[PDB]
Design a protein around this ligand. Structure first.
Ligand SMILES: CN[C@@H]1[C@@H](O[C@H]2O[C@H](CO)[C@@H](N)[C@H](O)[C@H]2O)O[C@H]2C[C@@H](N)[C@@H](O[C@H]3[C@H](O)[C@@H](O)[C@H](N)C[C@@H]3N)O[C@@H]2[C@@H]1O
Ligand SMILES: CN[C@@H]1[C@@H](O[C@H]2O[C@H](CO)[C@@H](N)[C@H](O)[C@H]2O)O[C@H]2C[C@@H](N)[C@@H](O[C@H]3[C@H](O)[C@@H](O)[C@H](N)C[C@@H]3N)O[C@@H]2[C@@H]1O
Ligand SMILES: [Mg+2]
Ligand SMILES: [Mg+2]
Ligand SMILES: [Mg+2]
Ligand SMILES: [Mg+2]
Ligand SMILES: [Mg+2]
Ligand SMILES: [Mg+2]
Ligand SMILES: [Mg+2]
Ligand SMILES: [Mg+2]
Ligand SMILES: [Mg+2]
Ligand SMILES: [Mg+2]
Ligand SMILES: [Mg+2]
Ligand SMILES: [Mg+2]
Ligand SMILES: [Mg+2]
Ligand SMILES: [Mg+2]
Ligand SMILES: [Mg+2]
Ligand SMILES: [Mg+2]
Ligand SMILES: [Mg+2]
Ligand SMILES: [Mg+2]
Ligand SMILES: [Mg+2]
Ligand SMILES: [Mg+2]
Ligand SMILES: [Mg+2]
Ligand SMILES: [Mg+2]
Ligand SMILES: [Mg+2]
Ligand SMILES: [Mg+2]
Ligand SMILES: [Mg+2]
Lengths: 218, 129, 88
RNA sequence: ACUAUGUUUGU
RNA sequence: GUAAAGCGCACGCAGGCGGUUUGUUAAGUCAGAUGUGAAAUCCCCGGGCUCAACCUGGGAACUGCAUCUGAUACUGGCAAGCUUGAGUCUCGUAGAGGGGGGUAGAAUUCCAGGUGUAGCGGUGAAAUGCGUAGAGAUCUGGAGGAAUACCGGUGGCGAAGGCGGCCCCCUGGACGAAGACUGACGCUCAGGUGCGAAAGCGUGGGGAGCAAACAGGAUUAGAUACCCUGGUAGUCCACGCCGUAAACGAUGUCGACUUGGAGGUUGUGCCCUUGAGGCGUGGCUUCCGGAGCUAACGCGUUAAGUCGACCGCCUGGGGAGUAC
């Protein structure tokens, strides 16, 4: 078990009928995930994540909602993996050869800001490049050092980050998503039922994933 | 108004496979049981049982392979509005032999391959690819 | 129409017992009683087409029941029609 | 308030 | 569905099709045999004209038909059943379902009268029109016809067309609960029959309002219109015709199966009914949407999805739903 109490699914009216196997008898117009079926799938998801981390793969932590942005960022940094915690860019994966130029621009401004020419030039255009920086960094900071396509994708909300999932699907990248009762577990290669918005649940998922890939890097 | 219980049985299988259901239940008849026997021996369905005493309910266990329905095509041939009878030398080959044609012969319900071996023709009940 | 007492009298007098309300003879007798009873209503209300449809439904049902009874066993069929006053 | 019409034929 | 194409709707004969079990038959079906299926032709191996065309040997084929023997799973026939389909009975429910009577209130118009006075009415603006013969406005009384404000609701009922003030009488259908009963009695339906908006027609009534036609005034280049002032048929009733509508969901009927969400209406079971509540279960309905389907739009358990039965209809645009 090791996770009960923290997560309870969405209201019944928003339930995806493809979540019925993982639903355990909604209590009061609120669906209850079958944790007895959650424990094995989550373990096999963690097991597979460990295996690809053993193959020295890259795991992208995709959580974009405000309640989980910082949790995704810290967990990925703690396990020295990459992440996207703000708005997912359409084509982050499928249009990599274009977003690659954008992270290159971000890296150049990073050198310019800290050590390059950033105060030896006109001030209005100086902070123009400054304000461009955090915009380009809060969108691409978590994937500055990817150097390519990732080998795995861990998603907090399946339906919310549906764009990322289908970007991984057509690229052939396995997806590990926390699929709640209102999401379609179709594009997910390793479905993990559970809450996608509760702070305690998300940190618990991220801590387990962060630990598991760390042991995979050994 | 339910004038083809055999096609109803095939449709329940076809709709059950499309809906990814584990089992499909239907009113039972000995012709349906004979057809279900052929399907089970050919590997299209896992199993069937005929529970019930005066109103028997035949329930078939559908079979899925790699997340896909095993029965891709199931099509009634000899419908009540048009009966199809084939002689032995003109029995149909379904999917060039990769499928079966359920045939009702004087020696019982069998596949087109079994009927060819027995040297018999008969009524072409359905194609199962 | 065809009040409970009128219905109860017909089934007892055309059926085996008081619960044999589904027999073809009972059904034909019940339809015949209602058809005859509605005859007075439609003599006065000749423009009541919507009620005529229910009456013609009774006539069609009685005809089909009588055809079934004739096909099944003619002896009861002949007995029933002379007892009810049928065949035009 | 309430007007009508716009010759034929091409690249 | 929108490209051509679902009859306006229904009942229903013939016909087509038909739940489930057993027995029997062997008609359909299947198997075998035998006979026949002229030769030529076609086709396949050959052979002869120097080759080819052509000629020619043999074989295959002639997919058919008939007879005999056999098989009996399915369809059919016959017999006996069974209960699921279908129907009957018991209790109850909702409803603008239909037909026939009666009645109420508001309003319009008209008639008579009182007060009162110079406008009223109408329009984009006007004018025609009405008004000192007393209008319009206001009040009282009366007559008459028609329709039923609010309720009223992608509410309900009906096969469809359609149906809403209230009351009574006669009457149809639907649905639900629990049982009992009959024991495929079913589905569809060419011909046939019935119903079938409005307009229209006939006979007889009625006639307030509205209003084709028509008249006048405008507008306009013209205005056989739109607008205004009137106004006949008609609209109303009874009976009898007609039988057509974008009679539409542009979607035939019946049956089965196939994720969901949010409502409405109408029953019904259980439970904490604590109170309009919760959990089921029906019928009918609205919106959205999944798979699937679709040319797309979109449909999507009320399918345009997956199937089965039967019917109707289409085969480029016009000519023409016209002529005969
Ligand atoms: C409840 N189903 C509806 C159906 O109902 C009809 O058949 C039912 C049978 O029981 C009747 N109960 C009902 O009274 C009757 O109306 O009418 C059709 C009409 C059709 N043009 C379309 O319109 C859609 C448009 O095509 C689309 O463009 C628009 N966006 C939405 C419309 N619904 O979809 C509806 C819808 O399929
Ligand atoms: C308990 N709440 C309601 C109940 O009210 C009654 O329930 C009990 C009787 O059973 C009584 N004891 C109780 O006092 C009374 O309150 O009536 C039913 C009627 C049923 N056709 C259905 O309609 C809904 C359906 O879901 C569907 O038909 C539609 N979508 C929406 C309808 N409201 O759901 C309601 C709902 O269950
Ligand atoms: Mg001109
Ligand atoms: Mg058109
Ligand atoms: Mg068309
Ligand atoms: Mg129609
Ligand atoms: Mg009919
Ligand atoms: Mg018939
Ligand atoms: Mg049968
Ligand atoms: Mg024979
Ligand atoms: Mg030669
Ligand atoms: Mg030969
Ligand atoms: Mg010959
Ligand atoms: Mg037989
Ligand atoms: Mg038989
Ligand atoms: Mg009996
Ligand atoms: Mg006809
Ligand atoms: Mg008529
Ligand atoms: Mg009229
Ligand atoms: Mg007239
Ligand atoms: Mg006028
Ligand atoms: Mg027409
Ligand atoms: Mg209409
Ligand atoms: Mg039409
Ligand atoms: Mg929809
Ligand atoms: Mg369609
Ligand atoms: Mg004509």
């Amino acid at each position: 078990m090791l996770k009960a109490g923290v997560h309870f699914g969405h209201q019944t009216r928003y339930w995806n009928p493809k979540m019925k196997p993982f639903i355990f008898g909604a209590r009061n117009k609120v669906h209850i995930i079958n944790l007895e079926k959650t424990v094995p799938m989550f373990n096999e998801a963690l097991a597979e994540l460990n295996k690809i981390a053993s193959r020295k793969g890259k795991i992208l932590f995709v959580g974009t909602k405000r309640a989980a942005s910082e949790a995704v960022k810290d967990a990925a940094l703690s396990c020295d993996q990459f992440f996207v915690n703000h708005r997912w860019l359409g084509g982050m994966l499928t249009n990599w050869k274009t977003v690659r130029q954008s992270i290159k621009r971000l890296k150049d401004l990073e050198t310019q800001s800290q050590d390059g020419t950033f105060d030896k030039l006109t001030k209005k255009e100086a902070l123009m490049r400054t304000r461009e920086l955090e915009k380009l960094e809060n969108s691409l900071g978590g994937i500055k050092d990817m150097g390519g396509l990732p080998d795995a994708l861990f998603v907090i909300d399946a339906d919310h980050e549906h764009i990322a999932i289908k970007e991984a699907n057509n690229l052939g990248i396995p997806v590990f998503a926390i699929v709640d009762t209102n999401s379609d577990p179709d594009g997910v290669d390793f479905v993990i039922p559970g809450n996608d918005d509760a702070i305690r649940a998300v940190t618990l998922y991220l801590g387990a994933v962060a630990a598991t890939v760390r042991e995979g890097r050994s | 108004s339910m004038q083809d219980p055999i096609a109803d049985m095939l449709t329940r299988i076809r709709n059950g496979q499309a809906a990814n259901k584990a089992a499909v239940t239907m009113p039972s008849s000995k012709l349906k049981v004979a057809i279900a026997n052929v399907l089970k021996e050919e590997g299209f369905i896992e199993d069937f049982k005929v529970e019930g005493d005066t109103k028997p309910e035949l329930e078939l266990t559908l079979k899925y392979f790699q997340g896909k329905a095993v029965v891709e095509s199931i099509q009634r041939v000899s419908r009540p509005g048009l009966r199809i009878y084939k002689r032995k030398d003109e029995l149909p080959k379904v999917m060039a032999g990769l499928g079966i044609a359920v045939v009702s012969t004087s020696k019982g319900v069998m596949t087109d391959r079994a009927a060819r071996q027995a040297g018999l023709g008969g009524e072409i009940i359905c194609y199962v690819a | 129409s065809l009040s409970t007492e009128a219905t109860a009298k017909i089934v007892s007098e055309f059926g085996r017992d008081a619960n044999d309300t589904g027999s073809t003879e009972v059904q034909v007798a019940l339809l015949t009683a209602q058809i005859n009873h509605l005859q007075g209503h439609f003599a006065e209300h000749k423009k009541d087409h919507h009620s005529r449809r229910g009456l013609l439904r009774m006539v069609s049902q009685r005809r089909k029941l009588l055809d079934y009874l004739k096909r099944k066993d003619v002896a009861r069929y002949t007995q029933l029609i002379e007892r009810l006053g049928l065949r035009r």
